[PDB]
């Protein structure tokens, strides 16, 4: 609002949204943390990582929990183990889920994650 | 041209379309000027950046009554003040080198204005805590308690602006102290008429003096 440094246009925000560097991609691949965990870490939302365990809260796939398979940064879609779908030829792939639609249960711990948690708390 | 319409006086026959300019920067330019001077003053410790002019006469028949801010005090007024040119540069008074200080009344008024400023002025120590009597008719170095106390207060910068003049000028005079004698219209015409006779006489006076 008050700052005149950054544009309030639709146009700049969209271009920034599409041309993202990796840290920005990581920011907009964050998900909301579980309620006791939010109290524990003092943190609303966290960037997704490989072995995280999420619960789906939106779409036809809502109420399903599960581990994250692969994250697709380019299409901004995470893949989870029990959201399979067969394709036109019957090949099974995982449904890609935008990270807005999932709440994170058990985050994966690692050295980088520890540093992030230390930074946050 | 047709009907009751006045003859035009426009000059748009030349290629004016690349010789035209429209001001859309005005209020922001004004803001920028304000910002620039404010920043400058603050950088100078908040000390005045204002320039104190001599009072000088506006010229010719039309404006001779009026008086305005002039270019600079110059040597005779500075000498009457007891201030050096170097001091005049050092302090906030305006500087010059070729404005003559003219008549007595104007000089006397401007030395009084200089004296008013000179009395007004307080000067911060040059090196801080190594106080001296110093040069140029500039004040001797201020003490630490006073200068700090003064720093907390507003500067008094009223004298920089032009002064006002007599508000009513409707004054009384008793009937028996005035007279009906005068012939002003006659006096004017005669004065212009007798100019030639005097000019000739004065030229002869000037020749005699020069001899």
């Amino acid at each position: 609002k008050f700052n005149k440094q950054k544009s309030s246009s639709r146009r700049k925000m969209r271009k920034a949204h599409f041309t993202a560097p990796a840290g920005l991609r990581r920011k907009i691949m964050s998900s909301k943390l579980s309620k006791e965990l939010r109290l524990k870490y003092k943190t609303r939302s966290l960037p997704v990582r490989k072995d995280d365990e999420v619960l789906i809260c939106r779409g036809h796939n809502h109420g399903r929990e599960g581990k994250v398979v692969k994250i697709n940064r380019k299409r901004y879609k995470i893949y989870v183990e029990r959201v399979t779908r067969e394709k036109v030829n019957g090949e099974s792939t995982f449904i890609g889920i935008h990270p807005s639609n999932v709440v994170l249960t058990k985050l994966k711990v690692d050295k980088n994650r520890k540093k992030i948690l230390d930074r946050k708390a | 041209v047709a009907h009751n319409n006045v003859l035009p006086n426009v000059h748009l026959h030349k290629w004016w379309q690349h010789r035209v300019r429209v001001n859309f920067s005005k209020n922001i330019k004004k803001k920028k000027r304000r910002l620039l001077r404010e920043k400058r003053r603050k950088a100078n410790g908040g000390t005045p950046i204002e320039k104190l002019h001599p009072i000088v006469h506006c010229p010719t028949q039309r404006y001779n009554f009026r008086t305005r801010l002039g270019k600079g005090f110059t040597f005779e007024e500075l000498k009457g003040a007891g201030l050096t040119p170097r001091a005049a540069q050092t302090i906030g008074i305006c500087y010059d080198k070729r404005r003559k200080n003219r008549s007595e009344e104007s000089l006397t008024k401007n030395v009084e204005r200089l004296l008013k400023y000179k009395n007004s002025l307080v000067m911060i120590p040059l090196k801080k805590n190594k106080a001296k009597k110093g040069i140029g008719g500039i004040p001797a170095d201020a003490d630490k308690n006073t200068i700090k106390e003064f720093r907390n207060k507003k500067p008094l910068l009223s004298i920089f602006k032009k002064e006002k003049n007599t508000k009513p000028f409707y004054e009384t005079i008793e009937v028996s102290k005035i007279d009906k004698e005068f012939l002003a219209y006659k006096t004017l015409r005669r004065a212009k008429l007798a100019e030639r006779r005097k000019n000739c006489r004065q030229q002869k006076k000037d020749i005699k003096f020069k001899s």
């Binding site: 246009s9 | 429209v22 859309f24």
Partner: protein, 244 residues
């Protein structure tokens, strides 16, 4: 754009070969070639009159007129019937101008402000403001004019302690300093009779500003308020009268 609709060279091969006498684009294999070059009827032809910054966008709005508009709008804001006509939900309000104590000026939070509006009786007005968040249609959207909201209270304040920060970020509610009143805020869409909420500080300062106590810096320099042409607008009472 200055050169737009005119940069191309232009040519005329159609006169003596039965094609209309507007200029045509020269060249061969390009499919611009032989097409109508420019002129306001043409593809690529630009404006009939090119817009320029020469245009008289602004106006001189005169000092006495400006003052009169502010004073008269404030007087109009006064009138209870006009407030309701302007669409303010006036029903539970308890005075004709809405005047609150000095103690208003220190209020500190959006909730406290909402509580105060509810306490005044403007809950329904606050409901209309919340409702009035709607998308503005057409090309405005592409030019970042996304929502339109309606206009409720105008808060007139002297002291800067809380109200300024508190009534900031309240949808549809406006703030103004007593000296620096704004006709654009007092009468949106040129509509007389906006709901005005005053501090006692503000109300008293207003009286000083436009003449009272003769305060040298606060007063507007030798300003005199206008007087009505009609002394009393109750014409029907004149008609009713015995002499009449």
């Amino acid at each position: 754009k200055l050169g737009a609709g005119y940069e191309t060279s232009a040519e005329s091969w159609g006169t003596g070969r039965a094609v209309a006498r507007i200029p045509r684009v020269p060249g061969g294999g390009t499919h611009r070639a032989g097409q109508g070059a420019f002129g306001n009827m043409c593809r690529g032809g630009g404006m009939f009159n090119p817009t320029k910054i020469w245009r008289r966008w602004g106006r001189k709005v005169n000092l006495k007129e400006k003052r009169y508009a502010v004073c008269s709008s404030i007087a109009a804001s006064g009138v209870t019937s006009l407030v309701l006509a302007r669409g303010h939900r006036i029903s539970h309000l308890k005075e004709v101008p809405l005047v609150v104590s000095n103690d208003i000026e220190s209020l500190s939070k959006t909730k406290e402000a909402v509580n105060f509006l509810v306490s005044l009786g403007l809950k329904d007005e606050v409901n209309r403001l919340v409702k009035s968040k709607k998308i503005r249609a057409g090309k405005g959207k592409m030019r970042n004019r996304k929502y339109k909201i309606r206009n409720g209270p105008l808060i007139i304040y002297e002291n800067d302690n809380g109200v300024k920060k508190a009534f900031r970020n309240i949808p549809g509610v406006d703030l103004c300093k007593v000296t620096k009143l704004n006709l654009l805020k007092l009468a949106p869409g040129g509509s007389i009779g906006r709901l005005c909420i005053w501090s006692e500080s503000a109300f008293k300062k207003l009286d000083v500003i436009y003449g009272k106590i003769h305060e040298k810096k606060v007063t507007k320099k030798n300003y005199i308020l206008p007087k009505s042409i009609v002394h009393n607008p109750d014409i029907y009472r004149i008609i009713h009268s015995d002499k009449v």
